[PDB]
Design a protein around this ligand. Sequence first.
Ligand SMILES: Nc1ncnc2c1ccn2[C@@H]1O[C@H](CO)[C@@H](O)[C@H]1O
Ligand SMILES: Nc1ncnc2c1ccn2[C@@H]1O[C@H](CO)[C@@H](O)[C@H]1O
Ligand SMILES: [Cl-]
Length: 345
Amino acid sequence: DLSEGYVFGMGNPLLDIIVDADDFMYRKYNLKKDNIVLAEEKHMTIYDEIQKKKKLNYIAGGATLNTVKMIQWIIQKPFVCSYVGCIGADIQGKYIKNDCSALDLVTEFQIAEEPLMTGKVAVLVSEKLRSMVTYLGAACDLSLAHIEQPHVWSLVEKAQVYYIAGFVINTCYEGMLKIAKHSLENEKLFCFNLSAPFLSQFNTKEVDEMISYSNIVFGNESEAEAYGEVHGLLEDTVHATARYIADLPFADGKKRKRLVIITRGKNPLLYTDSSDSEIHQFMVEQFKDDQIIDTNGAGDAFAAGFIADYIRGKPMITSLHAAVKAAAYIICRSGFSLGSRDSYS
Ligand SMILES: Nc1ncnc2c1ccn2[C@@H]1O[C@H](CO)[C@@H](O)[C@H]1O
Ligand SMILES: Nc1ncnc2c1ccn2[C@@H]1O[C@H](CO)[C@@H](O)[C@H]1O
Ligand SMILES: [Cl-]
């Protein structure tokens, strides 16, 4: 039985806008398969353009938020998880804030100065391509000051486990760095997600620095390849990356075990740790084509599933199965939708 605020996350609270996109959209905005981009000016028309389309699905998002609130949902004990993010003073931000309260997730949202609106993600869904365009908006205003407030920082201090996605590097690196240093200093469990290929390519220093404070690092095949190329791991890139990341020294240079898990879609995931000379394969659930509804957020769920079991003392393999279950649950659902806890099986 975990104490209240045992798990802490900070991240980008965003609204997912899920649309059945036409094929021209992907060529028009130069969007790649399963890719994530931070919007530039050339992307900005996308948001008004998709508003013209029917059947829009508006649902709470944000990688870190998805994970931490599903941990909360899994554990069922009220207020075990706490989350910090920056939203805007708009209806979207309030919707997200109410979504959290409904899940018994303790939050301390920073509110961005008007008229900076809550961030949003355009999720373009089609048969051939899945792609995301991110407008961070209010999420960028998350500040070290907000975090260092006594009523906020106290959430961090009582936390024994942290989850922060790589995505937070673009919004509040100073905050996530401070918390990571606190975690390693008090021998707590800091969990980190590689989140997206562009982070390893363009924010390599921040990624590697975070890794040096991370006890558990989550990644997928795509991120592992981008990471590996950047570090000159030309042969056996994915395996080489798992080994490299696992073996990277901790910030204080102390000998410690860092667990690394690299998911590979429908194919077996890889895992290893610093003390393990080998990399293991773990088979995952098989899906027929018609069973796959929407894989978006599967990675977020995977992490939540693993952590929720691992921090309660379940062994590695047991925790990996719980991670796949969490991921499979999201896969059979549209958006990061958490239904009634009873029907989780
Ligand atoms: N097409 C598929 N078939 C079965 N599982 C899938 C997919 C795609 C993703 N996943 C599950 O999500 C986890 C993290 O991506 C992966 O670990 C994995 O469990
Ligand atoms: N730059 C970012 N920072 C934080 N979260 C992000 C992004 C971009 C996309 N997402 C979130 O990722 C979820 C899918 O795993 C989607 O639910 C989507 O909201
Ligand atoms: Cl995030």
